[PDB]
Coordinates of C-alpha atoms in Angstrom, one line a residue:
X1 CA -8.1 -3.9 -34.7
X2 CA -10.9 -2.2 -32.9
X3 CA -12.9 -5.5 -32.9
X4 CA -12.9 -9.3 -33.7
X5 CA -15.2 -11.9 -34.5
X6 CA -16.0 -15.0 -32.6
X7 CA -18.6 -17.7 -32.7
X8 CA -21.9 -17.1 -30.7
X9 CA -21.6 -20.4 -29.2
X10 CA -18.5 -19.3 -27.9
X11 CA -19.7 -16.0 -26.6
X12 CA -19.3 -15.9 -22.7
X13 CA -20.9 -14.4 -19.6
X14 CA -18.8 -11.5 -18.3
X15 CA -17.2 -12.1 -21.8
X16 CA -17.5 -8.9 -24.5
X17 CA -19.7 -8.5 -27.0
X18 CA -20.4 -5.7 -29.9
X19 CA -24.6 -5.1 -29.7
X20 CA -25.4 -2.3 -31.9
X21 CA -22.2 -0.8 -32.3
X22 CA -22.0 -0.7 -28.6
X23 CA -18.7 -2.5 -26.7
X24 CA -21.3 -4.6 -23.9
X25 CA -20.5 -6.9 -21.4
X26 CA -22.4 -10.2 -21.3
X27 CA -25.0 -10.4 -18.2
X28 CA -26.9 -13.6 -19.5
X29 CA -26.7 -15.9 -21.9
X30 CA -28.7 -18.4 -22.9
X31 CA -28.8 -20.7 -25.9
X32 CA -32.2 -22.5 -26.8
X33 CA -33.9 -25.3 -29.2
X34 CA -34.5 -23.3 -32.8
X35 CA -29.7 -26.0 -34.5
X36 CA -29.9 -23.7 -31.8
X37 CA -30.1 -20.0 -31.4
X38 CA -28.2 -17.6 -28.0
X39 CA -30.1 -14.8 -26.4
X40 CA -28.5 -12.3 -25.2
X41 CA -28.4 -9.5 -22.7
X42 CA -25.4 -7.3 -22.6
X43 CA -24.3 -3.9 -20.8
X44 CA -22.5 -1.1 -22.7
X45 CA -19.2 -1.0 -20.7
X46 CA -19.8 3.0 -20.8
X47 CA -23.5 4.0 -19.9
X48 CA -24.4 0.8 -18.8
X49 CA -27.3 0.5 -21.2
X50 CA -28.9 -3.0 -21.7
X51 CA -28.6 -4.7 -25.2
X52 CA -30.0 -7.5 -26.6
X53 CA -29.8 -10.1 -29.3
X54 CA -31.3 -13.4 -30.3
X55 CA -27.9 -15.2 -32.7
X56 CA -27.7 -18.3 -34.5
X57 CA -25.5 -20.4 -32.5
X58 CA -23.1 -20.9 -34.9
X59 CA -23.0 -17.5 -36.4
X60 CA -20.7 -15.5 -35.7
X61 CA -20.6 -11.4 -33.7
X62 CA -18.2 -8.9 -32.9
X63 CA -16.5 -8.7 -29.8
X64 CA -14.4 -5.8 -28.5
X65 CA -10.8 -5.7 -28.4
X66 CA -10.4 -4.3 -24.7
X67 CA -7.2 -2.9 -23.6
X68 CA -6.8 -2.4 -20.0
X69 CA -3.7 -0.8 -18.0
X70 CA -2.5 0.1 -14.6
X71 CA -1.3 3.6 -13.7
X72 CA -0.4 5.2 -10.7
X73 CA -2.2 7.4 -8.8
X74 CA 0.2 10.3 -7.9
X75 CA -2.5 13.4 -7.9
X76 CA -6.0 14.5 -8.0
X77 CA -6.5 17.9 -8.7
X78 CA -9.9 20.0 -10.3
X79 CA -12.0 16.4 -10.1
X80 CA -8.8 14.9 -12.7
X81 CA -6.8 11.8 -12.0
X82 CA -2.9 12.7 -12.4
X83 CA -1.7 9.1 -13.7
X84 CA 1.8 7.7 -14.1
X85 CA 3.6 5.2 -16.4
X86 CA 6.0 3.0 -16.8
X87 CA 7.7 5.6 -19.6
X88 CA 7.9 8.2 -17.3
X89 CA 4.9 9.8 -18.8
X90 CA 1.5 11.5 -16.3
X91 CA -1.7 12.2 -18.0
X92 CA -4.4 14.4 -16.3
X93 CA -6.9 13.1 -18.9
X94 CA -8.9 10.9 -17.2
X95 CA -11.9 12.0 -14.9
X96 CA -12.2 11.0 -11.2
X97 CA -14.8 8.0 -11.4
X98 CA -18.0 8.9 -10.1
X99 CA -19.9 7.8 -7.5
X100 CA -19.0 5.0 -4.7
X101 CA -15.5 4.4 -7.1
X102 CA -14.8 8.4 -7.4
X103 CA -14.7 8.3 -3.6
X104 CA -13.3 5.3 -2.4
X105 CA -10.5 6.3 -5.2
X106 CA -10.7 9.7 -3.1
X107 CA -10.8 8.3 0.6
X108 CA -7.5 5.9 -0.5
X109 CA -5.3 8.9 -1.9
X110 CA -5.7 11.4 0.7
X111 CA -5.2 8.3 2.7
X112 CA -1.5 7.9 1.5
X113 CA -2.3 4.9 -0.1
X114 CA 0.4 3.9 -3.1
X115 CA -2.9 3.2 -5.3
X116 CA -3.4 2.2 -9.0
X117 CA -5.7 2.9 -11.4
X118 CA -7.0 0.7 -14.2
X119 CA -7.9 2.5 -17.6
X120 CA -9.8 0.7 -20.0
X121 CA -9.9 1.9 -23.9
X122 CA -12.9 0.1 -26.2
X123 CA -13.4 1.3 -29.9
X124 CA -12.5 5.0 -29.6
X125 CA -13.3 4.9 -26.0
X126 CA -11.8 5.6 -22.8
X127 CA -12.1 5.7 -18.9
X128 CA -10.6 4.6 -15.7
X129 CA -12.5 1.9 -14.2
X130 CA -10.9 0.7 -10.9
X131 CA -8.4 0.7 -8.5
X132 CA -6.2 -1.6 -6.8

């Protein structure tokens, strides 16, 4: 199930949230005197683009069922991550992270470095997001 719901009262900072059909991460969270209502700020895990939402404490929103995996990093060729499984399996899907990440994920590989890269799928969408 692409998403699930959960209780806005229960809604957490750095916890997940669905704001406008948007997968978002929660950056502040408040919950006020209306009962009781939470305000909320939230980053689309993708673009980074703010979201908000004023929500009935004990309402109830969509969060994002977030899968997140750990491949190794074995190649980097034509700006493309060449990442290894457990099955065996390498996918050149996934583009080199930009910026500061892209490079650090760079610097580490032609370092040597035995490095892995986390991938992270939300709704239909996909990227890598880290490394270790």
């Amino acid at each position: 199930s692409a998403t699930f719901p959960m209780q806005c009262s229960a809604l957490r900072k750095n916890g997940f949230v669905v704001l406008k059909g948007r997968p978002c991460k929660i950056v502040e969270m408040s919950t006020s005197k209306t009962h009781a209502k939470v305000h909320l700020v939230g980053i689309d895990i993708f673009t980074g683009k703010k979201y908000e939402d004023i929500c009935p404490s004990t309402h109830n929103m969509d969060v994002p069922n977030i899968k997140r995996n750990d491949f190794q990093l074995i190649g980097i060729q034509d700006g493309y991550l060449s990442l290894l499984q457990d099955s065996g399996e390498v996918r050149e899907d996934l583009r080199l992270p930009e910026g500061d990440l892209g490079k650090e994920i760079e610097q580490k590989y032609d370092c040597g470095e035995e490095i892995l890269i986390t991938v992270l799928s939300a709704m239909t969408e996909e990227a890598a997001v880290a490394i270790k």
